[PDB]
């Protein structure tokens, strides 16, 4: 990949009227001392006392591959499930034409890493020109916020170096 | 339903698990909203589960169907158990191994 165009795939202020978009921050991802979160994913949680099943599609009208990142979240105790997504038996499901995997929150005890007994799996996929990707969830989805339309090069690559540019 | 391989050769078995778009289709098709399909050989051994979802329509179908295969070895038995969503094997293939054959892509005429 030699270039891409970042675009706001589901804008935070307008895509999620029925879900809370302002509370998904964490000391683990902090910024300037306070809790914050990735800039390209939005962590939806429950609005008031209820987290209705969301479904949201994006169609790829970009005429390029679009890389879509997202996440499924796995909190440590069923109490956290409830306080976060209010649905103890929730699920997240993601379907492209190609990609197509239903996930499921697995509430467990993990050692604390960056002070977090919860874990979050990050996922990606290449949605092809024309294809549509649909997300359905009753909790635990870390929605895509910004995604990337890709320009293929060749003979580029990744290297590891401490030499100065 | 089990099949035992009395062929003295490998038998390739194909089958499918079906995933319809809405719970209404589950009901009309297999009547068991919480169904499952499970397939066990001695070697192969994977329980599957119907995942009802919204997919774009491909060949006019919001449902999808995964195709599966396996080599059941001489003597082995393969058992299918299901409460819906199984696309059963109908015909299967007993295999004769060669070597130095292969698959090629060509538009030259035979």
């Amino acid at each position: 990949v030699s270039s891409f165009e970042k675009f706001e795939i589901f804008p935070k202020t307008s895509s999620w009227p029925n879900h809370e978009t302002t509370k998904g921050v964490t000391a683990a991802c902090s910024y300037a001392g306070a809790s914050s979160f990735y800039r390209n994913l939005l962590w939806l949680t429950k609005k008031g006392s209820s987290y209705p099943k969301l479904s949201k599609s994006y169609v790829n009208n970009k005429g390029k591959e679009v890389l879509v990142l997202w996440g499924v979240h796995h909190p440590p105790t069923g109490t956290d499930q409830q306080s976060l997504y209010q649905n103890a038996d929730a699920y997240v499901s993601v379907g492209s034409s190609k990609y197509n995997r239903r996930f499921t929150p697995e509430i467990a005890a993990r050692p604390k890493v960056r002070d977090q007994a919860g874990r979050m799996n990050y996922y990606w996929t290449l949605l092809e020109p024309g294809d549509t990707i649909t997300f359905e969830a009753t909790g635990n989805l870390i929605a895509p916020w910004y995604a990337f339309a890709l320009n293929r090069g060749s003979g580029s690559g990744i290297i590891t170096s401490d030499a100065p540019v | 339903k089990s099949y035992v391989n009395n062929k003295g050769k490998e038998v390739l078995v194909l089958w499918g698990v079906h995933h319809p778009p809405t719970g209404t289709d589950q009901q009309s098709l297999y009547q068991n909203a919480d169904a499952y399909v499970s397939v066990g050989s001695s070697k192969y051994n994977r329980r599957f589960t119907p995942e009802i979802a919204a997919r774009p329509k491909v060949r006019d179908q919001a449902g999808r169907m995964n195709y599966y295969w396996t080599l059941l070895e001489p003597g082995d038995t393969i058992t299918f158990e299901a409460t819906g969503n199984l696309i059963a094997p109908w015909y299967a293939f007993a295999l004769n191994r060669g070597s130095g054959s292969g698959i090629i892509t060509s538009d030259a005429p035979v």
Partner: antibody
Amino acid sequence: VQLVESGPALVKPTQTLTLTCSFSGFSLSTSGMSVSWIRQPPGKALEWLALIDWDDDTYYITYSSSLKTRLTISKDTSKSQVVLTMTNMDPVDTATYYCARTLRVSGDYVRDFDLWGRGTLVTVSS
Amino acid sequence: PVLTQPPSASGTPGQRVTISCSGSSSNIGSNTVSWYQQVPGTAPKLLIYGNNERPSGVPDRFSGSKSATSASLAISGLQSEDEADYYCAAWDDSLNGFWVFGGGTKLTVLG
């Protein structure tokens, strides 16, 4: 769970209409909801106007630019009513105004325009 | 930003009718569609939500679909009380986001 819309039945052109929506009935329910205002001219299609969320404070107003700058929507949780105010009324605004609910019950899809008040006629005339 | 329906459609008792609703990528192309049935000049009733969950006490002859950027209402075994106006609706993610209703279609049972 009931909704009465209420407001002037008559308004002079250029005046501001305040319609209030009152909620009646208790709930031991684990659900929130937003309220929308939607209006319908006589013989015409429904037109969505605004919406306000019950547990949230977030709100939306039709992008419709003939009327994005005239609408205001507010809640008073203590009086359990939602107030629409619309400034600079024209005869063209004469219509039946409705307030309606969106029910959010957890894990189902959204109770989209759940439950409608009966609606009030509002005629703009001199 | 509008949702297009046919001005009207008709059928004979017994048949299926399908009223079609066409939007754009930021609304139907992204969100679930709801269908409303209206008796002339009374309050509308919710028929479909979540793309076809019928709210409690809607007959199962009412069904809906969404594919691409259009949706479609399906009323099977057409009966008398069915004659009314039908609206489709969707949330739209453009601008600061808003709700949109379709123009509505007029439905008459014939014969």
